[PDB]
Design an enzyme around this catalytic site. Structure first.
Site, PDB file in Angstrom:
ATOM      1  CG  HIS A  54     -44.846 -18.807 -38.456  1.00  0.00           C
ATOM      2  ND1 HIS A  54     -44.096 -19.095 -37.451  1.00  0.00           N
ATOM      3  CD2 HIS A  54     -44.147 -19.449 -39.514  1.00  0.00           C
ATOM      4  CE1 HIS A  54     -43.066 -19.663 -37.744  1.00  0.00           C
ATOM      5  NE2 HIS A  54     -43.086 -20.017 -38.783  1.00  0.00           N
ATOM      6  CG  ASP A  85     -45.967 -18.252 -34.481  1.00  0.00           C
ATOM      7  OD1 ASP A  85     -47.285 -18.324 -35.187  1.00  0.00           O
ATOM      8  OD2 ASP A  85     -44.861 -18.548 -34.977  1.00  0.00           O
ATOM      9  CB  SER A 149     -40.384 -22.766 -38.497  1.00  0.00           C
ATOM     10  OG  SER A 149     -41.803 -22.368 -38.160  1.00  0.00           O
TER      11      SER A 149
END
Length: 260
Positions: A54, A85, A149
């Site tokens: 992502h 992911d 992230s």
């Protein structure tokens, strides 16, 4: 009574000592002009960098900013499995800081862990392993934010327990084994090989079958009573494999996935 903390004014409980080793491993992958995507961890000494998919998806050009001064090393996508992911990037650069063995099995709820991200600028947020699932997830209360992230979640020895994953208090990282597993798979195979198949329409369950009754209880003998608890199960069964149990039943020869 009481307990502990360092008593004197000599120094104080800076995890900095244990963190900064792996903080060096955490790279920005793009404080004004912060159109940065999120972070990534240099996993290979040689040049490969783990991150979330992502973090990279949609990005027409990836510039990776390193911890040794702001020199934006350009990156090519080693591979992007969104189901996991995760995503790998190479930069042409020296013996870079590596990740570490954090065995995701070995970590447990309450393991001091640090979500190190680079959203520029190293950024470590600290918490503990909050939960551990399977789908395979570290929930942790180290501030997992999109800036963080794709960076490292690391146990107090600096070892990558997770690769942070932004979503939606509770912050999730992808287990440093699921990362290892898929990051090695991504260095090797183009993406993470996994095969296709309430039901819908495509080939493999049509190309080699025709699933009647719509809901397929078991998958190759393993019961599945949870919506997309098969998307993980059938995903597991490496495309080119054969799957069984139909629900009544039948067996399929499946095929490769897609670009989500």
């Amino acid at each position: 009574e009481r307990v502990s903390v360092p008593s004197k004014d000599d120094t104080i409980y800076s995890y900095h000592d244990s963190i900064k080793d792996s903080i060096k491993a955490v790279v920005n992958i793009s404080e004004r002009m912060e159109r940065a995507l999120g972070s990534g961890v240099i996993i290979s000494k040689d040049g490969y960098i783990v991150t979330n998919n992502h973090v990279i998806d949609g990005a027409d050009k990836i510039k990776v900013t390193i911890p040794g001064s702001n020199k934006e090393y350009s990156a090519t996508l080693v591979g992007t499995d969104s189901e996991s992911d995760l995503a790998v990037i190479r930069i042409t650069k020296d013996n870079l800081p590596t990740i570490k063995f954090s065995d995701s099995n070995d970590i447990s709820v309450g393991d001091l862990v640090f979500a190190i991200g680079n959203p520029f600028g190293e950024s470590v947020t600290q918490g503990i392993v909050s939960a551990l699932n399977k789908e395979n997830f570290i929930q942790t209360d180290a501030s997992i934010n999109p800036g963080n992230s794709g960076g490292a979640l690391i146990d107090s020895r600096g070892g990558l327990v997770g690769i942070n994953t932004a979503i939606i208090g509770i912050g999730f990282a992808i287990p440093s084994n699921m990362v290892k597993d898929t990051v090695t798979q991504l260095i090797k195979t183009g993406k993470i090989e996994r095969g296709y198949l309430s039901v819908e329409k495509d080939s493999p369950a049509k190309k080699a079958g025709i699933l009647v009754w719509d809901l397929i209880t078991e998958v190759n003998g393993k019961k599945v009573k949870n919506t997309n608890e098969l998307r993980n199960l059938i995903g597991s069964m490496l495309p080119n494999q054969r799957v069984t149990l139909k629900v009544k039943e039948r067996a399929f020869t499946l095929t490769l996935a897609e670009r989500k």
